[PDB]
Design a protein around this nucleic acid. Sequence first.
DNA 1: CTGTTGCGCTTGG
DNA 2: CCAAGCGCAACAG
Length: 258
Amino acid sequence: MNWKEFEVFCVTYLNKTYGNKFAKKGESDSTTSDILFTGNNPFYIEAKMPHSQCGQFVLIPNRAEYKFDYSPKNKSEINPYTQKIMQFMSENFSEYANLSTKGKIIPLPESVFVNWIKEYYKSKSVKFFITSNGDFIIFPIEHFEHYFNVSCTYRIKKSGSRHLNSKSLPDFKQALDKKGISYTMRGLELHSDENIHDKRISGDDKDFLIKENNGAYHVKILSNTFNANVIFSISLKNNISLFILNEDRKAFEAAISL
DNA sequence: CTGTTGCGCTTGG
DNA sequence: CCAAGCGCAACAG
């Protein structure tokens, strides 16, 4: 299943097993965490697939100073582990200053990255993670390293899309016409008997993406922002202590009972 | 009202 | 399986 279905699967399990106290938040909403527990001890739960990413922050190369600057537009604050990562990258500036989509790994001790994750998720009011290897695994954030291997890379990650808008409509129609596509439009709604699902076309410095939903097409404008972020990847361990697993399930049971 | 950015999410070439 | 990015919301203008 995909990540959206996986999160629903986790919420269904939580409500079935522990009562109707858990709610999934909006898909792709970056301002909140995946699952909210309702109770006198409220907290969020992150659902993670076995191979997932797990937080980021943008760094801007300062070529005049040969160091990295923490973006003032980042949505979490510098913690001591952020600072260790920035120090390593800045002291190795020539190795990281040339940004790439392939990414440059950061070979610091894994504990630095685990500690970043623990601080970051604490700051988001996330007390537990849920994952699955065929059975559901629920654990408190302080035990993260017993469940996931963590790595960290610095890579360009293009920013996301936006909806086609009225101002961009002439440019979009011009791009369609140059491609020879037969279509009509009612406002921002596109109609075509051609097979244009997931089609990419461009014009006047705009890259468009045509998505099919309902009974017609929804057009997106892709970003032109290509900044680079430190970003964490996690891989579920194949060998997890059953002793830790069982005590962590009891810790979850305590948290929802407070 | 529009375009930019950073964070969500593993993904699919 | 590894180089790579779109769906989303807050922001500034």
